[PDB]
Amino acid sequence: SAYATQGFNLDDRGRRIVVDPVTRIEGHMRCEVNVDANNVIRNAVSTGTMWRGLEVILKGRDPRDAWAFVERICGVCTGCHALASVRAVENALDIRIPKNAHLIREIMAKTLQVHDHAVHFYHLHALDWVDVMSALKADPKRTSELQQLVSPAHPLSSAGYFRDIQNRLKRFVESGQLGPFMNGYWGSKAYVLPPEANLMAVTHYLEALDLQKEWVKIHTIFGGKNPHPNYLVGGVPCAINLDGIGAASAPVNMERLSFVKARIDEIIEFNKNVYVPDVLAIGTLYKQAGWLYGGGLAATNVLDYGEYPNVAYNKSTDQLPGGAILNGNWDEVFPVDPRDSQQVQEFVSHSWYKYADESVGLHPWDGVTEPNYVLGANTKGTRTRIEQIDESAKYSWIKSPRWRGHAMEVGPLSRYILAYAHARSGNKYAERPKEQLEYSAQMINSAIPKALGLPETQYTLKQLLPSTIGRTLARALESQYCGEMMHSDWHDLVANIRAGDTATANVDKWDPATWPLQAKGVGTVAAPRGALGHWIRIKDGRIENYQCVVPTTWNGSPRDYKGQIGAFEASLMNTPMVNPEQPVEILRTLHSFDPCLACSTH
């Protein structure tokens, strides 16, 4: 029955709608909602529909091997788990890595951010905003004009170019084999873009598909392959020899570093000329249509661990500074400590796991992962044929992380809200995100409307950011910021090498005979989807416990012991649907979190 939590009035008495599978995500998710008499969502249920049990598999294994196992939690956010793992082991064993290894890890991390973000937006998210059939109606000349207004610097802008793209799309559709566009929701009134905007976006979808494979060659240089580049406890395996004897056979030489810089420069151009401008334009047009739904928990509670210190090992210099905000008070950021047993905790009250006591949340050093697949008495269907899931009981493979018992949103949006709050409090390391946000607000409120002959609006960042539009915007801005940062990292790397420091690995504690017999460690990462942590316990040279709390675990979590809802469920609340059995709005908002379900469950 109906209950109130976190200012949301949940009501499960309306029409039940099931979306299974949720597509254009990584992995497997089921979503159920109830809508009221006016087609407004009044209840939402997030069900992670996969589990593999990496935490169980890791037990007894060598901590030096762990990164490779947990890297395979996910091939989309590929490498971020490997980074968390090596950090966790290095923390447990007091291993200080060389400067070059730190910088190479940072470059790899920022490369993932850009690749993951841009591919998400174009290949997973765009079809929630862009009607590909409408693109067929566009005028090539007016599309060219729009392109020139949206991003003057982008060279692919001629009428003939758009006409050629449009013609290929026509032939494809006219074949009667629509492939990825088959059975789509085209023509729904939920789509608001003009044909020219649709054609411009579809064109960029194809452009991004061709370009994304170039960006990852940065991973390939430093880590051998993408997906799943190699990492190393104690540093990086990609030994440096710039031009010395054997340099041609070395993992990193000067020619290979120059190659990396070329890829970085291309990324800078793509973010500034294609990705950010498209999101600003699409965001402006949906703002103009009044589609500001999907704020959920972003309006109150956001969290990130903080990442990318200007000065290595000095957290006060984080360039994406973290912490926790509660109750929408952007004037106070609480510090977040992944070591504090009273802070990050996971409940399983509504998850398919068991604890000795499920009324409490476990900090991950004390985490437990024992499967318990069982359905509530109010389930419609059977154990192997679920028709309507019972959210009053256990309903997901995703655990329920909370911070000091609070339900939080994580991700690029959370990081951008935190960065804004820090910058306002006088944190200079967060100046770039603040600048990006204020520029974006001006573009969305004023500059783009004026350019398109639309009325100007006066949304504050406080009003604009906590929305599905805002969440999508933050991801694009973060991509741009990450490209800028690794551009700087590259210079720092080459400078350090040229100064005579070529070291890439600390091997002092490679041999297990040098380890403490018992140890615990934590590694955190600002992963593309938010706050990632790995918590390890080592005993007698083996993994005693290994617990992962992953960004989509936070966002996609089911209800906790107190019945509080997580970010996905909150974001869907109070959203009108044009047609309850076409999940356009559900997909648009869920996709704005960039759900990675393999990550969420591991």
């Binding site: 254009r24 497997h28 994304q212 060659k217 880590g223 993408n226 395996p237 679920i386």
Partner: protein
């Protein structure tokens, strides 16, 4: 008319799908627009829920015995199969259903081929490779975690050009890509032959690109195209970038001891 592909996903990390889109020759864009009809694929498809599931029925009916079933990931047998749920039912039920009328089945990656990470000890979900569940259909194994992009598109291209399955080895892998061990053509082979080895990370030997055998390289027992075709349009491969092969295309590579323990 382009050959339909129904691309299912079981328990997986989605690395194979990501590798597929890295292909430069041919471009994944050209594969999708001009070579196959990718009619179902959770990663990219516009339709969700009932609309997505309806596609399966439609394509199976109209293209009976003419679509390719591609499988990424694998089915779990524990938890009543509900450690992987699609449309409220066990993934294994979807897999069996779509398999029945497939012209051919491609097992993408080590997950579908052998089990990969989720099947490593103690395999809490009883994740099981495709060929152990579907036993009456021709299956091509394309192992690796993930396989090389050009290997994936190379298999598709062969199948579409010739309307035949490529020549397979005894393990069901295409010989055109998996006939050689990494060690056969590895550019560090002259160092191996001269007993020139890395002994500790970032030692002088590592900076000279010496052989990684003593650091655990499993190249000598691993069949893949990594040394020759290499990765991401021939940019590098694990060994060139300084880490030994971990044996990721071989059955049960996770449980063959530490990646850093040398072959005996």
């Amino acid at each position: 008319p382009r050959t339909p592909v129904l691309w299912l996903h079981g328990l997986e990390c989605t690395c194979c799908s990501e590798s597929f889109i890295r292909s430069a020759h041919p471009l994944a864009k050209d594969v999708v627009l001009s070579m196959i009809s990718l009619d179902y694929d959770d990663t990219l498809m516009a339709a969700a829920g009932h609309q997505a599931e309806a596609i399966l029925e439609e394509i199976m009916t109209k293209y009976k015995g003419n679509y390719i079933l591609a499988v990424e990931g694998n089915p779990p047998l524990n938890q009543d199969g509900m450690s992987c749920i699609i449309g409220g039912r066990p993934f294994i039920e979807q897999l069996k259903y779509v398999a029945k009328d497939a012209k051919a089945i491609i097992s993408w990656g080590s997950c579908a081929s052998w089990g990969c990470v989720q099947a490593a000890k103690p395999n809490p979900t009883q994740a099981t490779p495709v060929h152990k569940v579907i036993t009456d259909k021709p299956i091509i194994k394309v192992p690796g975690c993930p396989p090389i992009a050009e290997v994936m598109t190379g298999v598709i291209t062969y199948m579409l050009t010739f309307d035949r399955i490529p020549e397979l080895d005894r393990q069901g892998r295409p010989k055109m890509f998996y006939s050689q061990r990494i060690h056969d053509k590895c550019y560090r082979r002259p160092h191996f032959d001269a007993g020139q080895f890395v002994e500790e990370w970032d030692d002088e030997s590592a900076r000279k690109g010496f052989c990684l055998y003593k650091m655990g390289c499993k190249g000598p027992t691993t069949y893949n195209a990594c040394s020759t075709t290499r990765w991401n349009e021939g940019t590098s491969f694990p060994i060139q970038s300084g880490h030994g092969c971990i044996g990721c295309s071989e059955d049960g590579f996770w449980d063959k001891g530490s990646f850093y323990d040398r072959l005996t």
